[PDB]
Amino acid sequence: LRGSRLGAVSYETDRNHDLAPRQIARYRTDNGEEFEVPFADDAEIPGTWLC
Amino acid sequence: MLDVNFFDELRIGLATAEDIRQWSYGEVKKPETINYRTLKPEKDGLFCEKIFGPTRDWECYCGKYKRVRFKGIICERCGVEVTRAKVRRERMGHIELAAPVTHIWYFKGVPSRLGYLLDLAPKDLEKIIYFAAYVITSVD
Amino acid sequence: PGSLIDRAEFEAENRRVVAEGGEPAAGRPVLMGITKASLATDSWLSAASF
Amino acid sequence: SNNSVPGAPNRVSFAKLREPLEVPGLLDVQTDSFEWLIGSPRWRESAAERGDVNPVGGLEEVLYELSPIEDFSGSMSLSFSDPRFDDVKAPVDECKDKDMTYAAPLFVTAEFINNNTGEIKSQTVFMGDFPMMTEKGTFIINGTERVVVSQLVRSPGVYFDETIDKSTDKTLHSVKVIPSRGAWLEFDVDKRDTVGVRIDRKRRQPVTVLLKALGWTSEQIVERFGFSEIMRSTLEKDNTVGTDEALLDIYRKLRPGEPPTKESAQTLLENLFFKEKRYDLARVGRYKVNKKLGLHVGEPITSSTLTEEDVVATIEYLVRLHEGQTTMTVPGGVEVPVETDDIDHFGNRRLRTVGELIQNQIRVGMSRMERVVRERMTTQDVEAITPQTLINIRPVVAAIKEFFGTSQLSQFMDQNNPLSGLTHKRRLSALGPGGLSRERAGLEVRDVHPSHYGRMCPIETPEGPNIGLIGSLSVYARVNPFGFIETPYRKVVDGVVSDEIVYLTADEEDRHVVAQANSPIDADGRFVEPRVLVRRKAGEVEYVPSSEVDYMDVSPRQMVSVATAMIPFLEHDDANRALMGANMQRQAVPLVRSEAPLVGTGMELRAAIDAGDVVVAEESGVIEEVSADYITVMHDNGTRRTYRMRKFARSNHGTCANQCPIVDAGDRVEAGQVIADGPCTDDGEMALGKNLLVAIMPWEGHNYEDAIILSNRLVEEDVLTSIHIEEHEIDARDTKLGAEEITRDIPNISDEVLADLDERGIVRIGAEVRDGDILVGKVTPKGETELTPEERLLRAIFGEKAREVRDTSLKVPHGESGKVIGIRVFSREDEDELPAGVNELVRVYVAQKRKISDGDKLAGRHGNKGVIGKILPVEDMPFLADGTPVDIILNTHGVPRRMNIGQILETHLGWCAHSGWKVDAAKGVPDWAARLPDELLEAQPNAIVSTPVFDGAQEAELQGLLSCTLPNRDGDVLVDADGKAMLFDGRSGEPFPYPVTVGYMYIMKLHHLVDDKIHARSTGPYSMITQQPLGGKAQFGGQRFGEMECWAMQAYGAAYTLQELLTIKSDDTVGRVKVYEAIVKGENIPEPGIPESFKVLLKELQSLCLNVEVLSS
Amino acid sequence: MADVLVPPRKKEILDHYEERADKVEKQFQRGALNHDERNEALVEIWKEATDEVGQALREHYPDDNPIITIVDSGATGNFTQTRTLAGMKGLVTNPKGEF
Amino acid sequence: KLRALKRLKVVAAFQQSGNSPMGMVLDAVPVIPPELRPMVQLDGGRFATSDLNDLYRRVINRNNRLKRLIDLGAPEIIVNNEKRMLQESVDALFDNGRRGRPVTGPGNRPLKSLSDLLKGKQGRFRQNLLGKRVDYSGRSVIVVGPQL
RNA sequence: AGCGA
Ligand SMILES: [Zn+2]
């Protein structure tokens, strides 16, 4: 009697040494609200986004 | 949310809609959980990775940037933020209701809190909030 | 009236209110059972857990 | 002077009396009930002997009450008849092996009739497979072995009682006529004298309303009720009058909101109290009511519905109860005493047996079937249908299956020893469906009403939270066809004790007066002294003159159960410790030798051959061929028969079940003789332990506070050793990625451990295994997961394949070892019955020979339990002057304060039996030995003896026997008349300054062995929703550090240890791995984080729209 | 069992108190008193009998008898258990609570 | 005066704090993180939902039905009935069995709403606060150790 | 569901 999840343990703790260089994009809503989503250097920013 | 043994108060409080939709990270609006065939969470459902975080550490729904070096970013296509797979333990959702709805505890639990606030009998307030009778809310 | 409050808070309130116009709130000692004593505590977490 | 079993050893008895009635078949309460359900010819002829007029089985009864079933039109009907079985589809052992349920088909002749046109459509419908009771009074479901426990339930009928009103100090009498499948009525007297009549728990009604509704309007009330003073008082409190007036008003109350029309009122009363289909006080209730009101003196039992005569007689009897009338000579019937009833008196507490329970379940299943049948009986087109197209057997078979599996009466067979196998049957359980759970089963029903005598043992009952709820049937008790418990009695006419054995229920017990078996019968049926001990109706105890006694007990030990009856000298032990001893006598384990006890009762041979686990020569003859496997018997007329043994079969609690023959090839056997000993049996009779030399002195504190010390002799000579068999299982099933395979091509593992596995997975038979070893090489797909760079380069350097199939082979769990007896492998390729998505099922049977180890639990037959403090070498043991070491050393301090000196008397008598005696009757017989039986004046060494429980060794007789205890080999009377002996300290050497009691005591090894208890966890599995460590030794888990333990810690003030135990050992998910890292690296333990249950709590509160937040200052 | 000595005067004590029990029973039979009064009288009489039997046992046993030794040491057990092991059990309670 | 006291209680409770009473009626209902209402598969594909997913469904389906009804244009009877069902669904989500018949599941078993996760003996305030299983532990039968 | 202290 047991169970599991479709997950990755990925034993890697954390690394603040190198973060894949990333800018931040912003997609204002229809009511003057802004919700920043970071995007990588190689990221292809969308024209519009689900905020 | 995340802090250290710094503790002096635990303040409970009645929450407001702005607080709820500020708490949430997305708006679940489909009554589905998992694709029956591939056994993966649906998009925009009760278990969508975009709304509630990945099920797999440092991985994304469309396998674009599955690595630690890619962290904190959102995969542009599938939209799942890449991070550890325990944010699902914490991230919450919210449902925008097409019609406001009264909370039950403050209506039914005797003594009725709405009954005392609006000076209304519970026997007659049930008839209102369950669409059995009308209420005049203004007069000129 | 009829509400039950801690003796220390009662006395401190009386000390505060003798100034700014003096009126005493009339208090009487009570002997209350342990169930009600425990439930009428100050922390909401403990009362909820009880 | 026992008989029956020809080969039963000549066990000499101290019985001063002679029992007329032999012990009945101890498993009749199961076998006869089941055969009553079926309708077996044996039951048919027995009922012919004992109430011929109506021979009907439980099936026939349910089918008759079902037939006919008619549509609302009434133009067509359906009927059933002739329940009939086929032979079983597979034998007992095959069903047990292949996990099939031992059953046989049911065939019922259905018959559809069409009223308007007129036909009969008769078939033989397969009703379903039905489980069958085996020879041993047990059922076999899915291979496992199950027993249905008879259930004590309040009988339906009319119950009278009164309460006192402290506000008015008046007796308030009432009545409750509670039937099966009916309604609740309560005639009673209010604080103001008025006959309030509450119907179905609805506001009490003036009786006059109901009489008018009965047609006995106020006028007819006067016509019948004349002395009924409260009746005329309520003719004034009637608040109305008139048949239809009261009918309409009452019917408005009865069915509020529905038009109070007189028609529907009449139909309602008919449909609720006189429509059998909707209402029934069953046969039992009808008999109870007709005997309590004496309506029908002897009318054949039928008409399972109330009568208007019955209700008016009830009202008259209740008023007369308030009038305190002596009796009510009902017109047309007999005077019945006007006494209030009890609720625990066994005249009111009937016993549903297996037959009744299965019949009720079948009735419910047939109700569902019937609803479906009548539903489609209209929708289906006429002139086109048949009972084949009408009947549905799915709900019936489902009901039977859901009863036998997953019901708190279809209990798992508790067979760790043959006695337990017997005693789990015959067990009475007052908790069940339609029964009182422990929530409502308070103390009130847990006492021993004086009606239990001879019907339910007062001693045996589980010591846990079930004391009194679960009991066991008496030895001689029998089951009334109506579910009551009849008991045998010897009737005595004019002071002459006959042998006419009449069986009485509790009611007749109360009616008459009962004497004692241990009374001076003067060899003619005639009592000696006139003042005779006797019992009266209310449990009172008196000295009646020897003229009014009309019944006398069949024998002593009639009030005791089976297991308890095997405790020697029981009458000396206190009830508490005797109860403990009875509850532990069922917990012994089968040893490898199973030597019989020296001192016993008569109930070691009978309770052995009736236990079932002993092979019995069916019919007389001679022996042809013996083996360790089978015995061939040559009957006196041509036929031979092979009794197959059961060698090393695993029981339901992992204990051995070996059966070994005792006869020789040339021996002659007679019918009913023991032919092969079972697990705990020796030469026919029970052997639950061993006869050990015992001393009763406190030794070096090791036997401090119930601890026990054994010699190394028991370890060495294998005296106390138990074979244990565990069953491990694994299934190669289908998955999403592919199919799982049992094989040898396992992923990374040295070929060193693959030596035991056979060519095709599973291990070779006999290969010894240790904890963590492989048993079934089994591998399962894992798909594609990108590898960590470190393991990727490890594979690059060590050239190891990915082995996309992950490995989850069957590893024997931690802390277990032993040999591999058998390997039972199934397969889909063999077209064996496997559940969906399963390719290949395999089970492996491991076995171990657990020797007696310190910490195990040993106990005598007097509740003197105890763990083993230490096993000394044989030399450092107190040894007698003859060099014989004692084998176990009990503690003195436990004897006096526990009031169980039965062990001391057993010790003395055991030494007497071991040494052998010779009462030198040179000049006549000594004073003490005058009333001893013959051939007890001398005995041989190691001679077996028996003392029946309540007529046994007297103290004077024991002193006399101990006086002469002829010497062992030289002239050495080691034990003096007192019963003690001079022991030499084996350790230091000097003699002990005071003589010490020594003897032979029979002790048993209990099933609470250390190996099954020791448990530990450093880091193992974890829970799912909460991240706490798991629980149970089946898993690793940890120990629940519960709230009181928290309190203990706070009182100590150990805040840091509390923090550790509640944060970084249970729930700090990121803290556990950090703690482990620090421990391995030798660093410091980190500061706890936040508990996980606390964060869960926070998230639920925020989900409840409660803004919970933490504030710094 | 040789070390469990019975009080020799027990039969005489039993007959003496049995006579009083018989007299109370006779007085109840002749209607001089009701059911509960006679029950109470028997209870008191048998309490007296129990006390007398216990006293006789206590004065009978020696000091080196192991049972009275363990008791009088305070190691464990009260004197009532010895009284009930040898001598008299006394009164036994009803399921309801009466005697 | 007695009623005035009983009401002034809550009235002054709301006045003293910065709490607006708008939160008593609700417009956005939060959804608990999924690992706290997981569907863990058992070995064999027999999935194990958490009994809150069906309630969250009920609310989602009824909300979407209301949204489509209002978009399409529906009579007052249908729209008000739909709002009533939405209300009942939310009340069941928060405390099933409080008002009216408890919402049953298969086997006529009442479902476990959020309130039931805290109330009674089986709440969080007890099951994981009356004690926890702890790592680095063990147990065994005991024997007397006179030489210790 | 059953069981031990
Ligand atoms: Zn992606």
Brief overview:
This is part of a larger assembly, with one copy of chain A (51 residues), four copies of chain B and one copy of chain D (1113 residues). Chain A is mostly beta strands and 51 residues long. Chain A contains no helices and three strands.
Report on the architecture of this protein.
This is part of a larger assembly, with one copy of chain A (51 residues), four copies of chain B and one copy of chain D (1113 residues). Chain A is mainly β. Chain A is built from no helices and three strands. In chain A, strands 2-3 form a two-stranded antiparallel ribbon. Chain B is an alpha+beta fold and 140 residues long. The longest helix of chain B is centred in the last third of the chain and has 8 residues. The N and C termini of chain B lie far apart (49 Å). With 1113 residues, chain D is of the alpha+beta class. Helices cover 24% and strands 23% of the residues of chain D. In chain D, a hairpin with a 5-residue loop joins strand 15 and strand 16. In chain D, helix 3 runs parallel beside helix 12, helix 8 crosses helix 9 and helix 12 packs antiparallel against helix 14. Chain D starts with 11 loop residues before the first strand and ends with a strand. Chains in contact: A-B, A-D, A-F, B-D, B-F, D-E, D-F. Chains A and D meet through loops of A and loops of D. The site of zinc ion has 8 residues of chain B, from loops. Chain D binds one RNA strand of 5 nucleotides through strand 18. The PDB classes it as transcription/dna/rna.
- Gyration radius of chain B (Cα, Å) is 22 Å
Terminal CA distance of chain D reads: 92 Å
Shape of chain D: globular
| Main sheet overview of chain D | 6 strands, mixed, barrel
Work out the helicity level of chain B.
10-25%
Strand order of the largest sheet of chain D: 38-50-39-49-48-53
Bound molecules: zinc ion
Annotation field: number of helices of chain D: 27
Care to count the β-strands of chain B? Answer: 2
Helix content bin of chain D? 10-25%
The biggest chain-chain interface is: B-F, 49 and 50 residues
Helix/strand/pairing category of chain D: alpha+beta
> Beta fraction of the residues of chain B?
5-15%
How is the quaternary structure best described?
A: part of a larger assembly
Shape annotation of chain B: elongated
- Could you tell me the strand content of chain D as a percent range? 15-25%
Q: Helix and strand string of chain B, N-terminal first? A: EHHEHHH
Protein name (chain F): DNA-directed RNA polymerase subunit beta'
Function (chain F): DNA-dependent RNA polymerase catalyzes the transcription of DNA into RNA using the four ribonucleoside triphosphates as substrates.
Family (chain F): Belongs to the RNA polymerase beta' chain family.
Subunit structure (chain F): The RNAP catalytic core consists of 2 alpha, 1 beta, 1 beta' and 1 omega subunit. When a sigma factor is associated with the core the holoenzyme is formed, which can initiate transcription.
